[PDB]
Ligand binder design. Structure first.
Ligand SMILES: *[B]([O])([O])[C]([C][C][C](Br)Br)[N]C(=O)[C]1[C][C][C]N1C(=O)[C]([C]C1=[C][C]=[C][C]=[C]1)[N]C(=O)[C][C][C][C]=O
Lengths: 11, 251, 27
């Protein structure tokens, strides 16, 4: 939850 | 960082965040020393007592960040790692002697207002600035106190380098020439320290001769955070500089 | 090369809020 999601390219 | 303050925008543009792919979490700090090399502490990647042994595909590097948890669209740059190099004589068995590692980026990062490399010291710069009483600056997204919890944005604190005998007499751990300690003494009034999550981040100083920022240390270890009569220990970058060069020159 | 000169500070001749503290300690 804590961390906002990174764009799908990297993860 | 304990007893620090929010960093200003672009105040530490070589600051790098080491981020675990899954689960998604902040592992350590690091620093940008060129368009394709990042410097950090070896213990951020390898520490067998806690069953830690990260490889290239396990991590990401986030550069040009301010906010700890948000994805800073159009500002931060995320990079994959090509290869990790840990000092061959990194001593994880005893006292974290030679706690340093280099990480080569898959592709070069483009510099901007928020992304820019720090300089590595030469013998003369180290000699002139690495003196007891002289202050350096540490940055990170680590814990705010030992045990709010963690900051919303990058924290900064300035600390003085401490005399080697005082560093030695503050702990039972065997100190080496590849480390130096910093922080305020109990009677000095002021406080501040690095804490859990700040490891691998840079201890920098601004040269008064050429007005450039140089990375003199890497946050390595400490026994608690901001405890009276205790000091933070940092990897002595200049003393391991020949190893840095050799890795970069060879790979 | 260009290392250690921040785009939003040194490059523009602007100082951050606490760098003076460092300088004053270099005696
Ligand atoms: B880092 O974020 O990974 C952390 C930073 C510490 C700030 Br205080 Br300088 N570095 C550490 O936690 C290192 C890695 C292994 C243990 N460690 C220590 O800092 C020390 C003592 C130590 C142990 C073995 C060899 C050298 C030093 N830490 C503690 O045991 C405190 C409790 C840990 C809770 O955070």
């Amino acid at each position: 939850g804590d961390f906002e999601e990174i764009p799908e390219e990297y993860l | 960082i304990v007893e620090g303050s929010d960093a200003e925008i672009g105040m530490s543009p070589w600051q790098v965040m080491l981020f675990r792919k899954s689960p998604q979490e902040l592992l350590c700090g690091a620093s940008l020393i060129s368009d394709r090399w990042v410097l950090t502490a070896a213990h951020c990647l390898l520490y067998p007592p806690w069953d830690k042994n990260f490889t290239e595909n396990d991590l990401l590097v986030r550069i040009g960040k301010h906010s700890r948890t948000r994805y800073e669209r159009n500002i931060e740059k995320i990079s994959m790692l090509e290869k990790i190099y840990i000092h061959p004589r990194y001593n994880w068995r005893e006292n974290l002697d030679r706690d340093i590692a280099l990480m080569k980026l898959k592709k070069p990062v483009a510099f901007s207002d928020y992304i820019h490399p720090v300089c590595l010291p030469d013998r003369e710069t180290a000699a002139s600035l690495l003196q007891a009483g002289y202050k350096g600056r540490v940055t990170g997204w680590g814990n705010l106190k030992e045990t709010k919890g963690q900051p919303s944005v990058l924290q900064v604190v300035n600390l003085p380098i401490v005399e080697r005998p005082v560093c030695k007499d503050s702990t039972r751990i065997r100190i080496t020439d590849n480390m130096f300690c910093a922080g305020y003494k109990p009677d000095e009034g002021k406080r501040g320290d690095a804490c859990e999550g700040d490891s691998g981040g840079p201890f920098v100083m601004k040269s008064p001769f050429n007005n450039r920022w140089y990375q003199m240390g890497i946050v390595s270890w400490g026994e608690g955070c901001d405890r009276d009569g205790k000091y933070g220990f940092y990897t002595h970058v200049f003393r391991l500089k020949k190893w840095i060069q050799k890795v970069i020159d060879q790979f | 090369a260009d290392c250690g000169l921040r785009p939003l500070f040194e490059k523009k001749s602007l100082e951050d809020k606490t760098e003076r503290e460092l300088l004053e300690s270099y005696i």
